[PDB]
Amino acid sequence: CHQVRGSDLQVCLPKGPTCCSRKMEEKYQLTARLNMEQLLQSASMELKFLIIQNAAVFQEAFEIVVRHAKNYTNAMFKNNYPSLTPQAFEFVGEFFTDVSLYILGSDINVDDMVNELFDSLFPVIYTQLMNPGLDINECLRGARRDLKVFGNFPKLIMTQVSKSLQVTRLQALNLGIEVINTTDHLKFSKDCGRMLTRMWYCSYCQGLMMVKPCGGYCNVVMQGCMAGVVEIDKYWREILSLEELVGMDMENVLLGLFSTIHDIQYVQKNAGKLTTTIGKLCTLSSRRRELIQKLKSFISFYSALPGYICSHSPVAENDTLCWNGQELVERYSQEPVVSQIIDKLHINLLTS
Amino acid sequence: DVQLVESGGGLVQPGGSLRLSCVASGSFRSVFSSSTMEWYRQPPGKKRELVARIAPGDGTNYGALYADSVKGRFTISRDDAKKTVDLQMNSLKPEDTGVYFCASGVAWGQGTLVTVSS
Ligand SMILES: *[C@@H]1O[C@H](CO)[C@@H](O)[C@H](O)[C@H]1NC(C)=O
């Protein structure tokens, strides 16, 4: 034994003498673990960054649309119904506040936002538009619904916005990040670790300097190490469910709200009789495409993974003058965490 | 299901004519007569633009508006008994190529392709 880069070992099969002790054998074992990890990391890095990219972009891309619709709706009220301000500035704000909240997962009932909107809207119409000239507010809020002053305009808006706000209310992007990030942390069996050590490092224990492991030996070893991991391939390919969803807006619906609200005109068509009774009573899509394009190029990630480890490590794919795990030969002859990834790949929710 | 359903799109030569028809379906049929109906065009690689609008009628007249690009060539009409809005398109030009959508303030159709080419 020069520079290296009896017998009672527990990994390297000693044909005779050996250059390494039980302690250098344990060194070689931990560096195999570190090496496999780095290789898995490198395999998953480009895909991991791709989904991290788009998850950050797409998340920022809806709050802008809600702010823009709010200001447009506020401006249209200021310009066309100045007698309804500043009260309109308040119930418009109340509604679009709930819009964003509902988008981002809060417990918000859409039929409210619409109903609170029209419950807040009708008293100021009555007092300022229909019969110009505070204690009587609550009667008018109740008579709004008891007398159905807006007809089916609230229901129309309810269905218009509930359909668009439900679809907008990311899980799959973040889950892909979470499974792919799990891959570089996969713990393998102890037998796989002993075999990885024999494949990569035990040749140095026999005193060889340049000999590389046979590719065939690498595949038998890798197919044995990644036996549970390859089962994930079919669930990862079922990418396709994501491609199905991207069947796909909220801007037009929210921008169109003032027009529908203005068609107020219905109510005033009945101001005459209605007053009397109340008197008595009281590139985005382009980004989706490019993501799916790049994502399909990684559809074989879990099936190509054992070949990646073998190809991105020094091997004699020629299977000549190579290390078989215990001797230099002339020609080579012969789950929990995994199941959680399977279970999560639940998301295949993707019931377009 | 509530659907605005466009039809009558197709291929036509320059100077030809087409009639687009949009049918209001779903029991939207009750509000159609009180709804403004609109036709929009989306040319290839361009934004969607208003082509024609027709107001609700009082039984004697409809207020019709047209984009300047189609003025004197196109005619919007509506049949409240059938719940249809039609766009008669005459003296078609290559610039009239696009997907045509009927709309209301609450609903959009899926659109129909018009191609004006030799
Ligand atoms: C648009 O609306 C949002 C609502 O939060 C507001 O913060 C923003 O300043 C508005 N932009 C204006 C009024 O120019």
DSSP codes, B5-70? EEE--EEE-TT--EEEEEEEE---TTTGGGS-EEEEEE-TTS--EEEEEEPPP-SS---EEE-TTT
N- to C-terminal Cα separation, chain B:
38
Burial of A28 (0-12, 13-18, 19+ CB in 10 A): buried
By DSSP bridging, strand A320-323 and strand B18-25 are unpaired
Residue where the block lists tokens 């290390």: A323
Is the shortest distance between the CB of A144 and ligand 1 below 6 Å?
Answer: no
Cα dihedral across residues A347, A109, A99, B41: positive or negative: positive
| A260 with B34: Cβ contact below 8 A | no
The C-alpha atoms of residue A275 and residue A130 are separated, in whole angstroms, by 8
Q: Which atom of ligand 1 is nearest to the CA of A70?
A: 2
The C-alpha atoms of residue B56 and residue A269 are separated, in whole angstroms, by 14
Angle at A253 between CA B78 and CA A158, to 5 degrees: 90
Burial of A185 (0-12, 13-18, 19+ CB in 10 A): exposed
User: Which structure tokens are listed for A32?
Assistant: 């195999």
Q: Which amino acid is at A199?
A: M
User: B30: nearest CA in chain A?
Assistant: A152
Within 13 A of A98's CA, how many CA atoms are on the CB side?
18
The C-alpha atoms of residue B78 and residue B83 are separated, in whole angstroms, by 7
Can you give the resolution of this entry in Å?
Answer: 4.0
DSSP annotation of B108 reads B
With beta carbons less than 8 A apart as the criterion, state whether A33 and A193 touch. yes
The C-alpha atoms of residue B100 and residue B109 are separated, in whole angstroms, by 9
The C-alpha atoms of residue A298 and residue A278 are separated, in whole angstroms, by 66
| B105 with A263: Cβ contact below 8 A | yes
Chain B contact for A157 (CB, 8 A cutoff): yes
Work out the angle between the directed axes of helices A336-344 and A171-183 (0-180°, nearest 10). Answer: 160
- Domain of B32, in residue numbers: 3-108
Residue where the block lists tokens 């030809």: B16
What total of structural domains would you count in chain B? 1
Is the shortest distance between the CB of A70 and ligand 1 below 6 Å?
Answer: yes
The C-alpha atoms of residue B64 and residue B22 are separated, in whole angstroms, by 16
Distance (Å) from CA A70 to ligand 1 centroid: 7
Q: Which amino acid is at B107?
A: A
Is the shortest distance between the CB of A71 and ligand 1 below 6 Å?
Answer: yes
With beta carbons less than 8 A apart as the criterion, state whether B112 and B13 touch. no
* DSSP bridge partners of B47: none
Q: Which amino acid is at B117?
A: S
Distance (Å) from CA A69 to ligand 1 centroid: 9
Q: Is B95 helix (H, G, I), strand (E, B) or coil?
A: helix
Domain membership flag for residue B88: yes
User: Which structure tokens are listed for A37?
Assistant: 């990890």
Q: Which amino acid is at A273?
A: K
Length of chain A: 352
Closest among A251, A247, A239 to A103, alpha carbons compared: A251
Closest among B17, B33, B14 to B84, alpha carbons compared: B33
* DSSP bridge partners of B4: B24
CATH value at residue B38: 2.60.40.10
With beta carbons less than 8 A apart as the criterion, state whether B99 and B111 touch. yes
User: Which structure tokens are listed for A218?
Assistant: 């690498």
Chain B contact for A252 (CB, 8 A cutoff): yes
Chain B contact for A152 (CB, 8 A cutoff): yes
A340: Cβ contacts below 8 Å, ≥ 6 apart? none
A160: nearest CB among B30, B34, B106: B106
Is the shortest distance between the CB of A268 and ligand 1 below 6 Å?
Answer: no
Residue pairs between chains A and B whose CB atoms are closer than 8 Å = 17
Give the distance from residue B106's alpha carbon to the nearest chain A alpha carbon, in angstroms.
6
Length of chain B: 118
User: Which structure tokens are listed for B16?
Assistant: 């030809």
Report CA-CA distances (Å) from B32 to A115, A260, B36: 23, 13, 8
DSSP annotation of B96 reads G
Domain membership flag for residue B58: yes
Report CA-CA distances (Å) from A84 to A94, A127, A208, A264: 15, 9, 89, 11
Within 13 A of A181's CA, how many CA atoms are on the CB side?
11
With beta carbons less than 8 A apart as the criterion, state whether A214 and A324 touch. yes
The C-alpha atoms of residue A228 and residue A234 are separated, in whole angstroms, by 12
Work out the number of other CB atoms within 10 angstroms of the CB of residue B34.
16
Closest among A181, A237, A176 to A54, alpha carbons compared: A176
Cα dihedral across residues A47, A304, A183, A296: positive or negative: positive
Q: Is B72 helix (H, G, I), strand (E, B) or coil?
A: coil
The C-alpha atoms of residue B86 and residue B71 are separated, in whole angstroms, by 16
Closest among A111, A114, A79, A75 to A94, alpha carbons compared: A114
Residues in B closer than 8 angstroms to A259, CB to CB, are 105
Helix/strand/coil (H/E/C) assignment for every residue in chain A: CCCCCCCCCCCCCCCCCCCCCHHHHHHHHHHHHHHHHHHHHHHHHHHHHHHHHHHHHHHHCCHHHHHHHHHHHHHHHHHHCHHHCCHHHHHHHHHHHHHHHHHCCCCCCHHHHHHHHHHHHHHHHHHHHHCCCCCCHHHHHHHHHHCCCCCCHHHHHHHHHHHHHHHHCCHHHHHHHHHHHHHCCCCCCHHHHHHHHHHHCHHHHCCCCCCCEEHHHHHHHHHHHCHHHHCHHHHHHCCHHHHHHCCCCHHHHHHCHHHHHHCCHHHHCCHHHHHHHHHHHCCHHHHHHHHHHHHHCCCCCCCCHHHHHHHCCCCECCCEEEECCCCEEEECCCCHHHHHHHHHCCCCCCCC
Distance (Å) from CA A90 to ligand 1 centroid: 13
| B106 with A260: Cβ contact below 8 A | yes
Domain membership flag for residue B115: no
Q: What are phi and psi of B17, to 5 degrees?
A: -135, 150
* DSSP bridge partners of B41: B49, B100
Domain membership flag for residue B118: no
Distance (Å) from CA A67 to ligand 1 centroid: 6
By DSSP bridging, strand B112-116 and strand B10-12 are parallel
With beta carbons less than 8 A apart as the criterion, state whether B36 and B104 touch. yes
Burial of A320 (0-12, 13-18, 19+ CB in 10 A): exposed
Query: Residue with the nearest Cα to atom 11 of ligand 1?
Result: A71
Residue where the block lists tokens 């990890």: A37
Report CA-CA distances (Å) from A53 to A153, A173, A236, A316: 41, 10, 19, 37
Is the shortest distance between the CB of A63 and ligand 1 below 6 Å?
Answer: no
User: Which structure tokens are listed for A105?
Assistant: 């997962």
Interface of B with A (CB under 8 A): 30-31, 34, 36, 105-108
Domain membership flag for residue B117: no
Closest among A44, A49, A1, A51 to A24, alpha carbons compared: A1
User: A256: nearest CA in chain B?
Assistant: B105
Domain membership flag for residue B114: no
Report how this structure was experimentally obtained: cryo-EM
Residue where the block lists tokens 């690689």: B45
Dihedral of the alpha carbons of A231, A237, A238, A241, in degrees to the nearest 10: 160
The C-alpha atoms of residue B115 and residue B44 are separated, in whole angstroms, by 10
